[PDB]
Design a protein around this ligand. Structure first.
Ligand SMILES: C[N+](C)(C)CCOP(=O)([O-])OP(=O)(O)OC[C@H]1O[C@@H](n2ccc(N)nc2=O)[C@H](O)[C@@H]1O
Ligand SMILES: C[N+](C)(C)CCOP(=O)([O-])OP(=O)(O)OC[C@H]1O[C@@H](n2ccc(N)nc2=O)[C@H](O)[C@@H]1O
Ligand SMILES: C[N+](C)(C)CCOP(=O)([O-])OP(=O)(O)OC[C@H]1O[C@@H](n2ccc(N)nc2=O)[C@H](O)[C@@H]1O
Ligand SMILES: C[N+](C)(C)CCOP(=O)([O-])OP(=O)(O)OC[C@H]1O[C@@H](n2ccc(N)nc2=O)[C@H](O)[C@@H]1O
Lengths: 252, 253, 253, 253
């Protein structure tokens, strides 16, 4: 078992009388001497440290028979820049990752993109992460070059677990709980009633409009009729009436 | 035959050393002595004097074997009062009736309603006219009392003839003739047609406008409804689902 | 007097064993022994039989001390042909003449021009008509040959009356009455149109009012919605700080 | 280092041919020969497993030179019952504890109170927890009997962290956000209502204008009609005096 936490990058003596030399998959998988383990670097936010992270690092720890696991954790600043908010700030996460079972070494304030000098500084043989492309601003995959170096080691993501999930359970519950403790009833009932009332009113208004339209149409029709009559008028008809009337003047 | 016209009432000597005595149907129909004829009175407007009148007076002249026919003709004034217009005034009608074949005597300016003193003055035995009730103002029949006296003698009206008819033929013809000589034209007709067309067009336009207005109103109503709906919606249950995901966008992809 | 109408020619018997022998102006004016009256012929349409006609016939009857008056009445066909229309129809005018006072005998269906044989069968001694030469057919006078025989007796037209006047009065009155009435109806139509326009304006007003009401309702609804929103908003901080704590109570202290 | 997770209790073999014999603070702190580590028990929900937990476990692991750390994780049922809810579910927390650095073995479905037999089967030498007396059930401390046995090893709570805080941050942020969003929508909603009201009024005005126009058109039409009527009326007297005469021409001169 292990009594003490994982050394931060800084705590350890490192020797430059030893040149930078990576191993290859073959002689790494044959497994390295105990003095010279294979050195692997996994990186990420590790916000709300959870099982997915942990067995990702387990996968990574197990890649080779003899392995030394260094884990880069990104700063709050960088993470808010390129990604979004952390619920837990960088220190909590450093502690968090420090406390993991498969972790030999923790690297604070780790870079979004990995550089030749980073890889040389920390003597990294391989880089463990999931094989999805990581698109962080300006790059479609920030692991592209490490993949190309033959350096990249893919891992598998746990399903059902993720920080987004852990956040969404809580938020989900609190939303309905809060909204529920708002309406706490008469008013709510009234509102429902009001909507119904409003609807009824709207219907009435529509009906009224329709009626008005009908009236207008009728008026138009009447006008048309009048016009027609006028046209017709414009003696043949009224002669029959003219004569009899004229002769009324002469008696019964 | 007869050379001279019928005496007006005035021209004749009349004697009051002879009391007023009417006869009755029986001894009148046995026929009277030549010195004492039966005396009968027929009356009316006699406007546009015609055959109906004439054989009415013939009927009347023939009522008894010996008969003297006096015919009352009403004045213009009275006739316009109680009846209507005459086309011919009273003098023309006096002449007219004077010239009839069966007429012995003419009575000018005769009364609408006959009075005891009229009947006594002119010594009238009987009064000849058609058996229709004559309704002249205030009375349902102005012959009622003469009918009751046993004095009345009915007559028959000729059919097809009457002053109204004689007037209506003329008026009928002149109406259509005149109206006909008015429209007398093609150009005018064309113009009228054009005007009508224009009117129709205008009407159509108006209708279209109305329709448009209606449509607008409908649209407005719809908008109002939508607004109401929105308000109702506003009045968390719906937008929570959207609130949460959005909230979690903040934490990354 | 005379109780009976005038015979027609065909109603009458005539002795032809009596040769046709006319009589002179002289020995006629000496007067004609009772059984040989002078026989005079007068002719015409007698349309709208009137007093001019009648007095013409009176002159005719009085031309001699003893005179027999035969009067020809021309047919509808002859008359429509050579003259013009008639408001009276030939039978009506036959009757008309029949009821005249100075007329002994009526001759139906009379000739437009008079012939030796016509004058023979009716044994006509003289002819009575006005002395204005009569132009119809191609004849510039149809009586000229009767003149030349010295068989003509002129008469005098009466004044202010003739069949045309009687027409003209009625005609006029009906022309002015018709036309007047024609205008009045148009005025009534104009009055109706006023009514219609006013009704349309009121309907428009009503519509406007309705629209206004609708608008008001909408406004009210909006206000209500706003109020609701406000209420919702209110429903939160203090009771929030209450909420969260309450919610964490459930998982423990 | 450590490539492998922590066993559970049931994953593990145990020799019961070895009787249950505890060890003193003293001879434990002298250090325990490799094959007999001291065995320490620490317990808890470990909901939202965090650094306070982990350091608690580190203390637990370091209580002696040679120490075996067994850690009980209470169930969802026990926990919901005697404590409150958990956002983490018992399997999740089993795993959580499994991945801790100082933890040799994990015990699933742990007791709320510890029993002689529980302490027997797991061969538990000591117990590591904070020294704040734990009040749940009716017990005002559930560790008191473990205290009295002298079997208790206190530990220290870390600072500024605990499962409740992690809740509270998110809670707060979402309260202010959700309320803030709701409020913006009310702000947006009011503006929308204003747009709706502005739309309503303009439209109404337009409608009114249209109506007015229609009315005007109608009026114009009426006027036109009137004019036409007038014209018609104008279109008779002179030609009247022409007419009547013309009409009397037909009956003769
Ligand atoms: C910024 N980079 C790209 C340099 C480092 C990667 O950044 P990231 O966002 O992948 O960090 P993260 O904390 O989300 O993921 C950390 C590691 O845990 C793994 N992981 C995460 C969640 C999960 N349910 N299963 C996992 O296996 C990821 O594959 C990743 O390899
Ligand atoms: C005023 N009165 C009642 C006193 C007299 C009658 O007035 P009147 O209107 O009957 O006079 P009139 O000139 O219309 O009718 C005169 C006479 O002719 C008769 N007559 C009239 C028209 C006709 N087609 N046939 C007729 O027999 C009527 O019966 C009446 O007897
Ligand atoms: C056709 N004829 C010649 C055979 C017959 C004469 O035809 P007419 O046109 O003279 O007939 P008419 O009805 O006009 O006239 C009939 C008679 O009435 C007389 N008459 C008519 C109107 C009047 N105002 N005065 C008259 O004296 C005429 O002299 C004529 O003798
Ligand atoms: C129910 N029991 C008594 C059987 C087990 C204890 O239950 P609990 O409520 O202490 O469990 P928990 O998850 O709250 O605490 C787990 C462990 O982490 C430690 N812990 C937790 C939070 C913190 N800020 N500091 C700590 O030292 C506690 O001392 C405890 O020993």
């Amino acid at each position: 078992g292990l009594r003490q936490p994982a050394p931060f990058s800084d705590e350890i003596e490192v020797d430059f009388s030893k040149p930078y030399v990576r191993v290859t998959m073959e002689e790494a998988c044959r497994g390295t001497p105990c003095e010279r383990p294979v050195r692997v670097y996994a990186d990420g936010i590790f916000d709300l440290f959870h099982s997915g992270h942990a067995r990702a690092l387990m996968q990574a720890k197990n890649l080779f028979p003899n392995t030394y696991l260094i884990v880069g954790v990104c700063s709050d600043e960088l993470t808010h820049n390129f990604k979004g908010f952390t619920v837990m700030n960088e220190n909590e996460r450093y502690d968090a990752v420090q406390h993991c079972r498969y972790v030999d070494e923790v690297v604070r304030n780790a870079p979004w993109t990995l550089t030749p000098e980073f890889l040389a500084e920390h003597r990294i043989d391989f880089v463990a992460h999931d094989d999805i492309p990581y698109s962080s601003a300006g790059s479609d995959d920030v692991y592209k070059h490490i993949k190309e170096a033959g350096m990249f080691a893919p891992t598998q993501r746990t399903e059902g677990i993720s920080t987004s999930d852990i956040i969404t359970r809580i938020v989900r519950d609190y939303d309905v709980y809060a909204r529920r403790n708002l309406q706490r009833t008469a008013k709510e009932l009234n509102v429902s009633f009001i909507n119904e009332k409003k609807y009824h009113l709207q219907e009435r208004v529509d009906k009224v409009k329709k009626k008005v339209k009908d009236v207008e149409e009728k008026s138009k029709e009447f006008v048309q009729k009048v016009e027609e009559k006028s046209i017709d008028l414009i003696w043949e008809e009224k002669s029959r009436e003219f004569i009899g009337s004229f002769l009324e003047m002469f008696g019964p």
